[PDB]
Amino acid sequence: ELRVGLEESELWLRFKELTNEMIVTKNGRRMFPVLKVNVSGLDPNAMYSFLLDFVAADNHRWKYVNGEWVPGGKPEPQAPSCVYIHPDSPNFGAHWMKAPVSFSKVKLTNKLNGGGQIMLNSLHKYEPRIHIVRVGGPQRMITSHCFPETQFIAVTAYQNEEITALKIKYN
Ligand SMILES: CC(=O)c1cccc(NC(=O)N2CCOCC2)c1
Ligand SMILES: CC(=O)c1cccc(NC(=O)N2CCOCC2)c1
């Protein structure tokens, strides 16, 4: 059985209990915390690519009103985000299982851009999601996993200073 776990869930949970926020910039901002995933149960000799995308958790715009995030406009359909390919991809199962898979180089933006960076809508809520894609085999296979603990709202600056303070404390 292919097993996927979140590394440092303890920490992500401190962010989640406050309502997590991630900065997006025209050029793209790296995430903190970084999504790091423990994976077991791959074929060590099989060849996999790790993908990351961001599901819009609801159809609404969010706003920070009197120290609290609350839902906003009319329901708008949210198209899926673009996919980020882990730069170690493609790689042997052994490679992916030897250390946590860390998405430290993904950059989040609010502007359609050259490449690399993933465009999100500011003031929307997102749930990170990975796809583990067995490549180069005869038999194609995808396994997906969501990380509720890692949910955030995309912001062009932090609103809740409790988040600002945790970000600095742990970075
Ligand atoms: C929570 C919030 O801020 C908000 C704001 C505007 C509209 C709605 N939801 C609806 O009016 N709906 C949803 C179901 O489909 C049609 C009726 C919610
Ligand atoms: C915030 C807001 O306005 C909202 C949010 C969710 C649902 C709805 N509408 C209903 O719950 N309906 C639609 C009519 O049929 C009965 C159930 C409204």
Side-chain angles (χ1 to χ4, degrees), residues 127-161:
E127 187 167 83
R129 180 173 72 174
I130 62 167
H131 315 282
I132 304 168
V133 186
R134 192 175 181 175
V135 293
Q139 77 240 253
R140 281 319 194 4
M141 188 47 188
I142 301 165
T143 73
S144 302
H145 199 273
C146 296
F147 294 95
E149 323 107 301
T150 68
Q151 278 184 355
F152 63 86
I153 301 169
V155 299
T156 60
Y158 296 125
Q159 303 297 306
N160 177 7
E161 67 169 23

Coordinates of all heavy atoms in Angstrom, one line a residue, residues 127-161:
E127 N -6.4 24.3 -0.8 CA -6.0 23.0 -0.1 C -4.9 22.4 -1.1 O -5.2 22.0 -2.2 CB -7.2 22.0 0.0 CG -6.8 20.8 0.8 CD -8.1 20.0 1.2 OE1 -8.6 19.2 0.3 OE2 -8.4 20.1 2.3
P128 N -3.6 22.4 -0.7 CA -2.6 21.7 -1.4 C -3.0 20.3 -1.6 O -3.5 19.6 -0.7 CB -1.4 21.8 -0.4 CG -1.7 23.2 0.2 CD -3.2 23.2 0.5
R129 N -2.5 19.8 -2.7 CA -2.8 18.4 -3.2 C -1.6 17.9 -4.0 O -1.0 18.7 -4.9 CB -4.1 18.4 -4.1 CG -4.4 17.0 -4.6 CD -5.8 17.1 -5.2 NE -5.7 17.9 -6.5 CZ -6.7 18.0 -7.4 NH1 -7.9 17.6 -7.1 NH2 -6.4 18.7 -8.5
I130 N -1.2 16.6 -3.8 CA -0.1 16.1 -4.7 C -0.7 15.0 -5.6 O -1.7 14.4 -5.2 CB 1.1 15.6 -3.9 CG1 0.8 14.5 -2.9 CG2 1.8 16.8 -3.2 CD1 2.0 13.8 -2.3
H131 N 0.0 14.8 -6.7 CA -0.2 13.6 -7.6 C 1.1 12.9 -7.7 O 2.1 13.6 -8.0 CB -0.8 14.0 -8.9 CG -1.9 15.0 -8.8 ND1 -3.1 14.6 -8.5 CD2 -1.9 16.3 -9.0 CE1 -3.9 15.7 -8.5 NE2 -3.2 16.8 -8.9
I132 N 1.1 11.6 -7.4 CA 2.3 10.7 -7.6 C 2.0 9.9 -8.8 O 1.0 9.1 -8.9 CB 2.6 9.8 -6.4 CG1 2.8 10.7 -5.1 CG2 3.8 9.0 -6.7 CD1 2.9 9.8 -3.9
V133 N 2.8 10.2 -9.9 CA 2.5 9.7 -11.2 C 3.6 8.7 -11.6 O 4.8 9.1 -11.7 CB 2.5 10.8 -12.3 CG1 2.0 10.3 -13.6 CG2 1.5 11.9 -11.8
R134 N 3.3 7.4 -11.7 CA 4.2 6.4 -12.2 C 4.3 6.6 -13.7 O 3.3 6.4 -14.4 CB 3.8 5.0 -11.8 CG 4.8 3.9 -12.1 CD 4.3 2.6 -11.6 NE 5.3 1.5 -11.7 CZ 5.1 0.3 -11.3 NH1 4.0 -0.1 -10.6 NH2 6.1 -0.6 -11.4
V135 N 5.5 6.9 -14.2 CA 5.9 7.3 -15.6 C 6.8 6.1 -16.2 O 7.4 5.4 -15.4 CB 6.6 8.6 -15.6 CG1 5.7 9.8 -15.2 CG2 7.8 8.7 -14.7
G136 N 6.8 6.0 -17.5 CA 7.8 5.2 -18.2 C 7.5 3.7 -18.1 O 8.2 2.9 -18.8
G137 N 6.7 3.3 -17.1 CA 6.1 1.9 -17.1 C 5.2 1.7 -18.3 O 5.0 2.6 -19.1
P138 N 4.8 0.5 -18.5 CA 3.7 0.2 -19.5 C 2.5 0.9 -18.9 O 1.9 1.7 -19.6 CB 3.6 -1.3 -19.6 CG 4.3 -1.9 -18.3 CD 5.2 -0.8 -17.8
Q139 N 2.2 0.5 -17.7 CA 1.0 0.8 -16.9 C 1.2 2.2 -16.2 O 1.9 2.2 -15.1 CB 0.7 -0.3 -15.9 CG 1.6 -0.3 -14.6 CD 2.4 -1.6 -14.4 OE1 2.1 -2.4 -13.6 NE2 3.5 -1.7 -15.2
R140 N 0.7 3.2 -16.8 CA 0.5 4.5 -16.2 C -0.3 4.4 -14.9 O -1.1 3.5 -14.8 CB -0.3 5.4 -17.2 CG 0.6 6.0 -18.3 CD 1.9 6.4 -17.7 NE 2.7 7.3 -18.6 CZ 2.3 7.7 -19.8 NH1 1.1 7.3 -20.2 NH2 3.1 8.4 -20.5
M141 N 0.0 5.2 -13.8 CA -0.8 5.2 -12.6 C -0.6 6.6 -11.9 O 0.5 7.2 -11.9 CB -0.4 4.1 -11.6 CG -1.4 4.0 -10.4 SD -3.2 4.0 -10.7 CE -3.8 4.0 -9.0
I142 N -1.7 7.1 -11.4 CA -1.8 8.3 -10.6 C -2.3 8.0 -9.2 O -3.4 7.4 -9.2 CB -2.6 9.4 -11.2 CG1 -2.0 9.8 -12.6 CG2 -2.6 10.6 -10.2 CD1 -2.9 10.6 -13.4
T143 N -1.7 8.4 -8.1 CA -2.2 8.4 -6.8 C -2.3 9.9 -6.3 O -1.2 10.6 -6.4 CB -1.5 7.6 -5.8 OG1 -0.2 8.2 -5.5 CG2 -1.2 6.2 -6.3
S144 N -3.4 10.3 -5.8 CA -3.5 11.7 -5.3 C -3.7 11.8 -3.8 O -4.2 10.8 -3.2 CB -4.6 12.4 -6.1 OG -4.3 12.4 -7.5
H145 N -3.2 12.8 -3.2 CA -3.5 13.0 -1.8 C -3.6 14.5 -1.5 O -2.7 15.3 -1.9 CB -2.3 12.4 -1.0 CG -2.6 12.2 0.4 ND1 -2.4 13.1 1.4 CD2 -3.1 11.1 1.0 CE1 -2.8 12.6 2.5 NE2 -3.2 11.4 2.3
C146 N -4.6 14.9 -0.7 CA -4.9 16.3 -0.2 C -4.3 16.4 1.2 O -4.2 15.4 1.9 CB -6.4 16.5 0.1 SG -7.3 16.4 -1.5
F147 N -4.0 17.7 1.6 CA -3.5 17.9 2.9 C -4.3 19.0 3.6 O -3.9 20.2 3.6 CB -2.0 18.3 2.8 CG -1.2 17.2 2.2 CD1 -0.9 17.1 0.9 CD2 -0.7 16.3 3.1 CE1 -0.1 16.1 0.4 CE2 0.1 15.2 2.6 CZ 0.4 15.2 1.3
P148 N -5.5 18.6 4.2 CA -6.3 19.6 4.9 C -5.5 20.5 5.9 O -6.0 21.6 6.0 CB -7.3 18.7 5.6 CG -7.3 17.4 4.9 CD -6.0 17.3 4.1
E149 N -4.6 19.9 6.6 CA -3.7 20.6 7.6 C -3.0 21.8 7.0 O -2.6 22.7 7.8 CB -2.8 19.6 8.2 CG -3.4 18.2 8.3 CD -3.0 17.0 7.4 OE1 -3.1 17.1 6.1 OE2 -2.5 16.0 8.0
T150 N -2.9 21.8 5.7 CA -2.0 22.8 5.0 C -2.9 23.9 4.3 O -2.4 24.6 3.5 CB -1.0 22.1 4.0 OG1 -1.7 21.6 2.9 CG2 -0.2 21.1 4.7
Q151 N -4.2 23.8 4.5 CA -5.1 24.9 3.9 C -4.6 26.3 4.2 O -4.1 26.5 5.4 CB -6.5 24.7 4.4 CG -7.3 23.7 3.6 CD -8.7 23.7 4.0 OE1 -9.1 24.4 4.9 NE2 -9.5 22.8 3.4
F152 N -4.7 27.2 3.3 CA -4.4 28.6 3.5 C -5.3 29.5 2.6 O -5.8 29.1 1.5 CB -2.9 28.9 3.2 CG -2.5 28.6 1.8 CD1 -2.7 29.6 0.8 CD2 -2.0 27.4 1.4 CE1 -2.4 29.4 -0.5 CE2 -1.7 27.2 0.0 CZ -1.9 28.2 -0.9
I153 N -5.3 30.8 3.0 CA -5.8 31.8 2.1 C -4.6 32.6 1.5 O -3.7 32.9 2.2 CB -6.7 32.8 2.9 CG1 -7.8 32.1 3.6 CG2 -7.1 34.0 2.0 CD1 -8.6 32.9 4.6
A154 N -4.7 32.8 0.1 CA -3.7 33.5 -0.7 C -3.9 35.0 -0.4 O -5.1 35.4 -0.3 CB -3.9 33.1 -2.1
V155 N -2.9 35.7 0.0 CA -3.0 37.2 0.4 C -1.8 37.9 -0.2 O -0.8 37.3 -0.4 CB -3.0 37.3 2.0 CG1 -4.2 36.6 2.6 CG2 -1.7 36.9 2.6
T156 N -1.9 39.2 -0.6 CA -0.8 40.0 -1.1 C 0.0 40.6 0.1 O 1.2 40.9 -0.1 CB -1.2 41.1 -2.0 OG1 -2.0 41.9 -1.3 CG2 -1.8 40.5 -3.3
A157 N -0.5 40.6 1.3 CA 0.2 40.9 2.6 C -0.5 40.2 3.8 O -1.8 40.1 3.7 CB 0.3 42.4 2.8
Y158 N 0.1 39.9 4.9 CA -0.5 39.2 6.0 C -1.5 40.1 6.7 O -1.3 41.3 6.8 CB 0.5 38.7 7.0 CG 1.4 37.7 6.5 CD1 2.8 37.8 6.6 CD2 0.9 36.5 5.9 CE1 3.6 36.9 6.1 CE2 1.8 35.6 5.3 CZ 3.1 35.8 5.5 OH 4.0 34.8 5.0
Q159 N -2.6 39.5 7.1 CA -3.7 40.2 7.8 C -3.7 40.0 9.2 O -3.8 40.9 10.0 CB -5.1 39.9 7.1 CG -5.1 40.2 5.6 CD -4.9 41.6 5.4 OE1 -5.7 42.4 5.9 NE2 -3.9 41.9 4.6
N160 N -3.6 38.7 9.6 CA -3.6 38.3 11.0 C -2.1 38.3 11.5 O -1.3 37.6 11.0 CB -4.2 36.9 11.2 CG -4.2 36.4 12.6 OD1 -3.8 37.1 13.5 ND2 -4.6 35.1 12.8
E161 N -1.8 39.2 12.5 CA -0.4 39.3 12.9 C 0.1 38.0 13.6 O 1.2 37.8 13.7 CB -0.2 40.6 13.7 CG -0.9 40.6 15.1 CD -0.4 41.8 15.9 OE1 0.0 42.8 15.4 OE2 -0.5 41.7 17.2

